[PDB]
Design a protein around this ligand. Structure first.
Ligand SMILES: Nc1ncnc2c1ncn2[C@@H]1O[C@H](COP(=O)(O)OP(=O)(O)OP(=O)(O)O)[C@@H](O)[C@H]1O
Ligand SMILES: Nc1ncnc2c1ncn2[C@@H]1O[C@H](COP(=O)(O)OP(=O)(O)OP(=O)(O)O)[C@@H](O)[C@H]1O
Ligand SMILES: [Mg+2]
Ligand SMILES: [Mg+2]
Lengths: 635, 635
C-alpha cells in the first residue's frame, strides 16, 4: 500500500457556484504495480496527483501515502524517496544539462562522483545532445527528456509521472514506456503514470479510470476487457545545491554585475564635487560715485594707504572677497537696479558722492552724529534674494567684509584692532569648528543612506524570480524547506554587499577628506549593519508582492519618505512634537544620529547616544526577518 | 502555390561548430491541400514553421509564401489572412475566454456584434466551460482548445498549426482532426499541421517527411504506403484592442491602484512638515554670576525695568527668544562647559560678576575704553557646533538678539535708535524677501523631482512584461507593429500620470500654501510636460533591459545622481567649470531654474530664462522616444 486515499472531498470556487472536482475518490495503489490513471479531459485528475504529493490541501479528506499524510514526519512525500514530474516543463532555462542534473543531484544527498557516473548512462539511454548545451536551445521534445531524466536518476520508490511522453516520436515513446516496466520487475518501485495514449497504456497492471469525480474501476487491462468492452481500449546538501545556482546567476550576466560595482563610486564622486562648495561665479553692480566712469568692467581704484583717509569707498572694495564676487560698474543707481532686475547681476551697491567725508565724520564723532550725516555714509545695497541660498551668502559676506575694513581703519592708524567688536565673544567650540559647512553635516547621513538603498535594489527581485523561472513547485517536493531559500539568499547577497560597502567608505574617507575623529573600526560595523537591514527590507517587499510590476514601485516609492523622516538635510528637531516622536523608531533616524556622534564628536560605543543606533538597527533586522519568514511559510 | 521555399539554408551554432539544422529544404504546398509535416524528434521542424511566418530569418535562401516573402507588402503573412497557433500555449492567464477572444477579435477587423456568434459556435463545437471563466483557472487540456479556437475564428486562408492535439482525449482529438477536413473540402484554405501522432495523419493527402534538414517525400499517404513500404513508415481596430487590455490589468489591482494615488499625498505632507521649520527645542547653560543660585530652573529674573541701568545681564536674557530657546542655570563655568560636553545642552553663556559695571562704562568712554574693562563685559559662549545646522541658528540668534538689547538701551532714556547698525543697509529686496527660508528654495525643484520619479516607477515594467505573459510571439504575426505597442503604452499611462500630478500641485499650493506669483497656468503645463519626459525615460530602461532584475537596479540606482546634479538642495554654482557646464544639458537642471524664476520672480514665458526649460526638456522627450524606437524595432 504505497498510496491509499479514502473519502477525498475537494471543490473549487465559492459556495454559490461550486465545482465539485472530486466526490469520493476511493483508490488503492499496491507496491510493485504500474498504476495507470486513465480518464477523460475535464475531470479532476491532475488535481489528484498534485494532492498526493502534498501540493494542495485535500479539504477535509483522509490521505495516506508511503506511511502517512504528506508533510508529516510519519510519511515520506517530501524527501528523496518520492519521484515527481510536472505536467509542464518546470526547468530552468539558463542551466545546462550537466548543471540542471547536478542542482537536483546533491539535493537528495547524492555524491558528486556518482551523479556524473550515471549521467552518461541516462544520456546514452535516451538520446540527447552534448551535456554542455544549456536547456533553452533544446527543442520541444528534447526539453521533456531532460525533465524525465532529472527526477528519475536518484532511484526513488514512488513515481508520480504525469504525461511523460507528450511531444516525442513513437519510437522514443515505446523506449520510455519500455523502461518503467523493467525497473518495476523486481518489486522495487511503483509508477502512477497517467497518459492520454490509451492504447499505449496496455502494459500497466492496475489500470484506473475516472468518470465523475471518483474512480469508476481499477482492474487489470486484461480483466477490464470482457466486462465493459470487447477489444482494444474502449541540511548541508540542500544549502550547497542552491548556493552555486545563485552565484552562477550573477556570472551569466557579467557586465551588469560590474555595473553595480561602478555605481557607489559614481554616486559618491558626484556628491563630493557638488554639495558643499560655495558659489564662485556671482557678480555685482558697483556704482561708486567718486571716480570717473570709463568703460564697463573697469574703474580706477588708486586709494590711499596710511593714516590719511581718502577714497574710503574704494577701500571697502578690494577688501571684500577677491574670488567669489565679480565687479561690474554702472554710472547711475537707477541703472544698477535695472540690470539686477533683468537677471544681469545679483545685487547693486551704491556709494554716495560724499562718502569719505560722511564716513570720516561718523567715526571721529561718537554719539553726536546728526541724522543728515548718518544718512550719506551708508552703503545702499539692493539684493536679488530670489535664490535663498546665494543671497544668504551675499549678505553674509558684505557685512563680514566690513569687519576687516573696520579693523584696517582702527588697527593701522589710531588704536588696537579690537574695539570694533561686538561684546558677544564666541570663544572656541568644544566639539565642532568655528567655520561650519554644509558638506560636513550631511555626509554622515548620506553614507548610511547610499548603502541602505543599494542593498534594497539588490534584494528586491530575489524572492520574486523563483516562480518566474520555474524549478520551485517541483523543488518543494524535493525537501527544500522555505526557510532555506531565504537563508541562502542572505548569504549570497551579503558577500557582494560588502564589496560595494567598502568602496563607499574608501572613496569617502581616503580619496575625499572626511574627518574620522572617532574610532574607525566601529564605523565599518555600523555601516554593514545598516546595509544588512536594507537587504532585509527588500525581502519583505518581495515576499508581500506577487507580480513583478507590483514590487518595483513599492521600494521605489520609499525613496523620498525615508529621506525626509530621517535627519539628512535638516535637523530632526525641526519637526513638530508628534511627528518627531513617531520618526524616532525608524531604521535610519537613530543610526545617523549615532554616526554623527562618532565621526565628528569622537565618542565611543559606551556612550548612551552611540549604542542606541546599534540597538535600534538590530531589532529592525530581526523584525524584517520574522515577517518575511512568516509570509513565505504562509504561502 | 500558396507556400513554397527554394534552397533554404539555416544554422544555429557559432562558427567552427555549426548545427546545420537545414540544408536544402525544397517543398511546395498546394492550392487547397492539408500538408502534414511529419518527421523525427530532433530535426528542424518547428524552426521551419517559425521561418515561414517570419519569426525567424533564413541565412541564404529563397522564401515565397502567399505571393512573396514575409515582412514585405507583397505577401500577407503579417496580416489577417494567416492563421498561427504556437507549439506552446501563448495565452494570457488574466483574461477570460470572452476577453481573450475579443482581444484577438477586433485585431483582424471583426465587428463586435459578429465575434459573439462565432464564439458561441466554437464553444458549442468544442466543449468548454462558461465564457466568463478565467483562462488561468482552466485545466491543461482546456487551455489548448482555447488556443486552437483563437487562431481559427477569423477564417484565414492558410492555417499553420504545430502539435494542436497534445493533451486532449482521443474522442475530442478525432473531432478536432475532423474539423480541418470539413472546412477544407472546397478549394479555399490550406492547413499545415505537424503532429507526433502519426496514426491520425493518414487523413491528409500531402504527407511530408524529413530525415536530415531536407524533405524526403511529398506523396499522398495511400501512395506512400504503396511505394517503398507496407505500414509504419516512421489601424483603428488594433489601437482599440490593446487599449482595453492595458486598462484591464490596472483594474484587477484596485488595492494597488489606490496606493499609487496616496504616494503623492504622503511624499508631500512629509516634506512640508519636516523641512524648513526652525528648531524649537534646545537648551543653554546660563551661569550669570549676579544673582543667587536657587534650584536648577530659577534665577529671580528682575532687571529693574526703566531708564536705570541695573542687571544688564538679566536684561540681555529674556531678550533672546521666548519660544525656541530653553534656559537652564549652573553655578560655575567649569560646570557649564561640562554639561554641554556630555550632551546635556547646546552652549554655555557666561556673565562676569561685574557685567553691568563693565558694560555701563564701555558705552560711556567708548573709544577711550581700556583693555581691562574691554574683557570684562563680554558674554563668553562656548558653542557645541557639532551639528553645523543648529549651531548656526544659535550663532545667528545670540548676536541678532543683541541688536534688540542695544536698541532697548539707546531708545530708553534719551537717544534715537538709529546709530546701532553698521554702515551697510540692505534696503528692500527686488524679488525675494528679507527673511529667506530653506523651505522656499527646495520647493521649486522637489515638485518636479516627485513627478519625474513617480513617472519612472509607472513605465518601467511595461515593455519587459509583454514577453512574460506571452501574447507577443503570436501578436507580431497578427499585423501588430512595434510602433503601436509603445504608443498604446503612452496613452494609458499619461491618463493616470495626470491623476497624480494634479494631486501634487493641489496639496502643495492650495493646502500648504506655496507661493506662486508669476502664472498658475504655465506651471501646470511645465510640470505635466516634464513628467512625460520621466515616463519616456523609463521606456528606455525597459527597452534595453531583457532580464527584469536589471530594471529595478538601474532605475532606482539612477536617482542620487539626479538629486546631486540638478540643483535641488544646493544652487548650481559650486561645482567646477567642467561639471557645471555639462550639468546644464540634463532634463531637470534646466527645468528647476525655469520654474524657480516663475514662482518667486514672477516672470513669464517670453523671458529667455523661462522658455529654455520648455525647449531643453521637449528635446529630451524626442530623444528618449527615438532611442526607444530603434532598440524596440531592431535589436
Ligand atoms: N486552479 C483552478 N481553479 C479552479 N478550477 C480549476 C483549477 N484548475 C483546474 N480547475 C478545474 O478543475 C477541473 C479539473 O481540472 P484538472 O486540472 O484536474 O484537469 P485534468 O485532468 O488535468 O485535465 P486534462 O486531461 O484536460 O488536461 C476542471 O473543471 C478545471 O476547470
Ligand atoms: N534557439 C536555438 N538555438 C540553437 N539551437 C537550437 C535552437 N532551437 C532549436 N535548436 C536546435 O536546432 C534543431 C531544431 O529543432 P526543432 O526545434 O526544429 O525541433 P522539433 O522538430 O520541433 O522537435 P520535437 O518534435 O522533438 O519537439 C534541434 O537540433 C535543436 O536542438
Ligand atoms: Mg496532466
Ligand atoms: Mg512541433
Amino acid at each position: 500500500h504505497a498510496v491509499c486515499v479514502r473519502h477525498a472531498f475537494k471543490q473549487y470556487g465559492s459556495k454559490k457556484n461550486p465545482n465539485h472536482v472530486l466526490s469520493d475518490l476511493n483508490m488503492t495503489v499496491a507496491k510493485g504495480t504500474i498504476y495507470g490513471l486513465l480518464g477523460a479531459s475535464g475531470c479532476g485528475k491532475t488535481t489528484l496527483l498534485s494532492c498526493i504529493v502534498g501540493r494542495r490541501r485535500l479539504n477535509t479528506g483522509e490521505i495516506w501515502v508511503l506511511g502517512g499524510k504528506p508533510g508529516t514526519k510519519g510519511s515520506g512525500v517530501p524527501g528523496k524517496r518520492v519521484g515527481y514530474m510536472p505536467q509542464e516543463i518546470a526547468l530552468y532555462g539558463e542551466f545546462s544539462i550537466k548543471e540542471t542534473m547536478m542542482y537536483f543531484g546533491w539535493i537528495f544527498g547524492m555524491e558528486s562522483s556518482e551523479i556524473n557516473e550515471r549521467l552518461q548512462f541516462l544520456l546514452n539511454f535516451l538520446d540527447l545532445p552534448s551535456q554542455n548545451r544549456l536547456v533553452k536551445n533544446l527543442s520541444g521534445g528534447q526539453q521533456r527528456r531532460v525533465s524525465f531524466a532529472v527526477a528519475l536518476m536518484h532511484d526513488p520508490e514512488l513515481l508520480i509521472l504525469d504525461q511523460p511522453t507528450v511531444g516525442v516520436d513513437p519510437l522514443l515513446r515505446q523506449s520510455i514506456w519500455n523502461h518503467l516496466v523493467q525497473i518495476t520487475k523486481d518489486g522495487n518501485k511503483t509508477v502512477i503514470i497517467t497518459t492520454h495514449y490509451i492504447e499505449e497504456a496496455r502494459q500497466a497492471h492496475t489500470i484506473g479510470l475516472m468518470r465523475s469525480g471518483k474512480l469508476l474501476a481499477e482492474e487489470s487491462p486484461h480483466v477490464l476487457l470482457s466486462m465493459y468492452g470487447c477489444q482494444s481500449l474502449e541540511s548541508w546538501g540542500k544549502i550547497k545545491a542552491l548556493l552555486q545556482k545563485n552565484f552562477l546567476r550573477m556570472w551569466r550576466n557579467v557586465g551588469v554585475m560590474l555595473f553595480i560595482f561602478a555605481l557607489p563610486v559614481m554616486q559618491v564622486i558626484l556628491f563630493c564635487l557638488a554639495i558643499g562648495r560655495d558659489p564662485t561665479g556671482l557678480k555685482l553692480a558697483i556704482v561708486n560715485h567718486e571716480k570717473n566712469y570709463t568703460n564697463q568692467s573697469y574703474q580706477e581704484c588708486s586709494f590711499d594707504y596710511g593714516c590719511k583717509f581718502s577714497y574710503l569707498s574704494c577701500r571697502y572694495l578690494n577688501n571684500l572677497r577677491n574670488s567669489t564676487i565679480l565687479k561690474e560698474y554702472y554710472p547711475d543707481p537707477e541703472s544698477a537696479v535695472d540690470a539686477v532686475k533683468q537677471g544681469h547681476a545679483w545685487g547693486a551697491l551704491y556709494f554716495t558722492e560724499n562718502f569719505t567725508d560722511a564716513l570720516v565724520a561718523r567715526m571721529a564723532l561718537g554719539k553726536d552724529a546728526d541724522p543728515e550725516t548718518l544718512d550719506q555714509s551708508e552703503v545702499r545695497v539692493w539684493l536679488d534674494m530670489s535664490n535663498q541660498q546665494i543671497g544668504i551668502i551675499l549678505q553674509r559676506d558684505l557685512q563680514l567684509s566690513y569687519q576687516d575694513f573696520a579693523k584696517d581703519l582702527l588697527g593701522a592708524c589710531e588704536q588696537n584692532p579690537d574695539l570694533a567688536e561686538i561684546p558677544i565673544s564666541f570663544k572656541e567650540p568644544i566639539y565642532g569648528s568655528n567655520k561650519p559647512s554644509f558638506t560636513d553635516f550631511v555626509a554622515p547621513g548620506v553614507i548610511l543612506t547610499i548603502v541602505f538603498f543599494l542593498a534594497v535594489a539588490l534584494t528586491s527581485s530575489a524572492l520574486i524570480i523563483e516562480r518566474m523561472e520555474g524549478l520551485l513547485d517541483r523543488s518543494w517536493v524535493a525537501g527544500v524547506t522555505p526557510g532555506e531559500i531565504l537563508f541562502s539568499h542572505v548569504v549570497t547577497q551579503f558577500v557582494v554587499m560588502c564589496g560595494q560597502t567598502a568602496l563607499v567608505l574608501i572613496f569617502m574617507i581616503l580619496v575625499f577628506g572626511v574627518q574620522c575623529k572617532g574610532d574607525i573600526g566601529w564605523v565599518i560595523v555600523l555601516t554593514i549593519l545598516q546595509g544588512l537591514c536594507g537587504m532585509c527590507f527588500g525581502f519583505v517587499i518581495s515576499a508581500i508582492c506577487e507580480l513583478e510590476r507590483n514590487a518595483i514601485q513599492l521600494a521605489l516609492g520609499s525613496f523620498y519618505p525615508t529621506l525626509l523622516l530621517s535627519g539628512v538635510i535638516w535637523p530632526i528637531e525641526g519637526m513638530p512634537t508628534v511627528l518627531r516622536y513617531v520618526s524616532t523608531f525608524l531604521p535610519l533616524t537613530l543610526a545617523t544620529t549615532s554616526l554623527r556622534a562618532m565621526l565628528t564628536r569622537g565618542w565611543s560605543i559606551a556612550e548612551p547616544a552611540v549604542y542606541y543606533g546599534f540597538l535600534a538597527t538590530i531589532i529592525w533586522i530581526v523584525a524584517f526577518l520574522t515577517i518575511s519568514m512568516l509570509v513565505l511559510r504562509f504561502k
